[model samples]
Target chain A: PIVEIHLLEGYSDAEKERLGRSLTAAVQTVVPAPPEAITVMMHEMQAADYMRGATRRTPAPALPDAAATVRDFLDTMEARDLDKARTFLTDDFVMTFPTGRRMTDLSDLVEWSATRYRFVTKTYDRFDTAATLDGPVVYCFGTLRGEWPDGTPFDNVRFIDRFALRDGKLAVQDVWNDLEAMRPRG
Target chain B: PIVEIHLLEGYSDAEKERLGRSLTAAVQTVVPAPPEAITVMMHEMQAADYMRGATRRTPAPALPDAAATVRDFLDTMEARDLDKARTFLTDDFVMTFPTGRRMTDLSDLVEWSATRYRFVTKTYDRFDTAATLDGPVVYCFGTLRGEWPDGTPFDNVRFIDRFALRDGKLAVQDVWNDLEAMRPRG
Candidate 1:
């Protein structure tokens, strides 16, 4: 399945180009599918246009003990250190994209990572996560702040990431965000 | 959960009423829930509305010696004796309905049979069934021909029933069928 990303604003041409590259690199590193087959779609929308029940607010609350594991993973990605992010996943883990594509094994993950980081630049404003009895599946939701190589900035981009752990290690991860909400504001 | 039935045009209101009662009684016997809670919805539809897709179809053809079992079971029912049907099931067997209700134990089965026979009048057309490696789990599908007490004729009603046997005895049974499809011509 393709990993869906929802943003609060539209990406600039440069940002989209870089996003295409970074996503490819990041996902390919954990999924065994070919880079070309790893599809990622970004939707941009207005912040106010999104609402959960009666509230138009985000729900990224920090996890107990600060969810150090998830925090470190995000930090490593923001820092563009592919090796650090890879450490959080198991060797036999599988990553499914929202596009319904599945990548099995660590080798597939690495291949995807190499392609994504080549152009994508992911910036995080804040990430909140939580743990449960079912081996700590974390939900990280917040704004995304960053710029592509062409200096196009992405700000106030709402995003959510779902991470599942197995045998005390990350086994599956899913992400949902709106890219359309982030269409460049005049 | 409610078991809903849809029938095609041609049956009289009396026939529909009897079928409704028979279905309710039959399902209640196998389902663990209350008789009143077991709701049945009947509809009438044209043949064009139905199609037999593999997933929607039963596993009757895949089992071994299913046709023989169906014949035996029908014979037992015709004899108006509970021993044969009881012998076909497991001691601690469970029967599930399309409404997702389950009935366990032989007493429930007998009670259901007593109530269901009050309204239902059915004749079997061709019965096809199959068994699996899992201890003679048989899938049987066929057409039921009969009429309601008011003289409404019913034919070509598709039915599928699953029976799980242990030690040559029945342990579990589940069924699915459509009455609306058996309604008489306009």
Candidate 2:
């Protein structure tokens, strides 16, 4: 079986090679065949020649190490190092909490979280990432463990955080968690 | 990023899910983003509705345990159990060697090999498979270790074998290896 991919210019050979092998494995999962029999060919096109909605396109810059960027950001936030945490975000960074509350300032988020819990930490299970025209988006899924407002502790509260990066800085964070569901309904 | 796949009908939900994740990973290696941001949707069409050229197409039957089939056949061959090994193949099975020689009978292959080596065994590193309209193809890649005709030891001889299965039985075998290149020149 032959699978051909047309890609925008700018991807490195190593990156494309990884994509090829991954695609081969992906196809094998659907229909069993030897990798030798399945061929993947890539045709790269100039970004200037590609257009979407009448706008000419250029490939976005390669993303930074997303996993490292995210882990450092989260570590600073958890350590209550607001100064360091703020460095990770863009000027207009926005964060949306599980309660649908949104905040632009890290200080505001810290203040708001005090009403819900004393301290929370994430124990990550996995980090998944993707690249887009806008920027890189990173998702971290894990369980939350920390203390509550009343000094009660919680453990194993499943949570997922979706982070969008712009200019190599965090621009948006949307969070989902089971904390509210497990809480006593007011 | 959104990916829509149009597939001929007959794949299981579990198989598609695996393919979806694998594709997401493939894209991530090329671009870089969160899995949450990458959407994959499958659209299935009946085999009768899909046409290629003058012939109508039907989804091939789901592949059997290809890894198991290949492993069992290799094991039988290595054990010199020709009786059991023959059972794994179709009556019209064909085998091709790196030297560009082809043989249709296991007995002939055994006789041919006696002049090269005392015995040989494969140490498998991986098995890759893919399914096609005709049948499934399995590739076994590994190193070979054996003694030469003079009882001299040989090891780490890279080899790959491609097997095509028809009616769930082996029908074609192609082999490539470094043995010929490594052989002593007269």
Candidate 3:
């Protein structure tokens, strides 16, 4: 089966390459298959290429180039700089997860990120030299070993993060992690 | 919303004209809308245009003119001639319904047809005509009504049939009906 990830944001050449590498690596680890056997595809869209649910937003604002924006967002998350993340987000920003969970504002996103950080630490082990439509979108996936605020252990948290760049800043961020695959064995 | 129906068989100009008129009338009566608002499309297929499922059966038989074979098969069904229908079908012939139900072998199909005839009398009001990638197909929709041996009434049965002509006879037939909509009302 072909799995497609659709992102409603544009990316710079360099940023696309880096994202693809990260995604390829992440999926390979989680799927119990060789890296070469996995076919991970990503589709990037200009803001005009997508609709925000029922609302039509077109001719999106011109921002700084895609590459610069991706670097800034990744750096902020890596450094755990909540302030930097806030700077990149709009005041009325809304982030919706694949599970349909959503965070509607900078404060809510930060609160959620804090909880995420407590459970797992992530690091990029490899980066693609260039980005192409045929390449992966991100390159990292691994086991997570920690306890949540409720004292539940979070183990083997395989996941991927996708970024939507707008005006050289982070407009949307999506995260995919398999909870069922990481569930504790009885 | 646009709805298009595609059929894969050939019909004469007269048959096509009759089908078109009947289909248009039937739709208007059933849909409670202006007749002009309803659009009916028809297409025909060539003998070599399509295969029977994954089978090697072509639109035509390996022998003589394929057109005559297709016409004869269709005539048998339209006339409700059971002997003609059986002559063209293999003892193990199968008919697959659009609802995913399968009638294995000609016996099962004939048995079901007999029951249908016993319950309701149907008339082919109209069958417009068209062409397909494989060959010529007809556009036909009409009304059916009657009573079953068990006294169950049958009426307003809408249907579309796709027929395949083989060896100067009907080799395959696919049918779609509005059974769910016409289920016995409380």
Off by over 4 Å in 3: A1-186, B1-81, B89-93, B112-117
lDDT by residue for model 3 over A1-186, one digit each (tens)? 112344445445654444344334332211223345434355656656566566744432222434445556666766767777778765655565423356766556567655544555554422211121221112222334566555676654444344443323455554444443334345
* Candidate 1 share of real interface contacts: 0.00
How good is the docking of model 2, by CAPRI class? incorrect
TM accuracy, model 1: 0.28
Q: Any idea what lDDT model 3 has? A: 0.44
**Please, what are the lDDT tens digits per residue for candidate 1 over residues A1-186?**
133444445335554444344334333222223455545565656668765458764422212222456677767766767777787878866665322236865456557645322333345543322222232344454455555334576655444455656544677765433332233334
What are the per-model DockQ values? 0.01, 0.06, 0.01
* DockQ versus reference, model 1: 0.01
Best by DockQ: 2
Q: What is the lDDT of residue B85 in candidate 3?
A: 63
Candidate 2 lDDT over B1-186, as tens digits, reads 345555677778766775676566555544555667666666788767666677766565555565678899989988889998999889999997644467999999999989988988899976644333344456666678998898988887766676777767889886656565345545
Worst 10 residues of 3 chain B by lDDT: B57-66
Candidates in descending lDDT order: 2, 1, 3
The TM-score obtained for chain B of candidate 3 when compared with the true chain B = 0.47
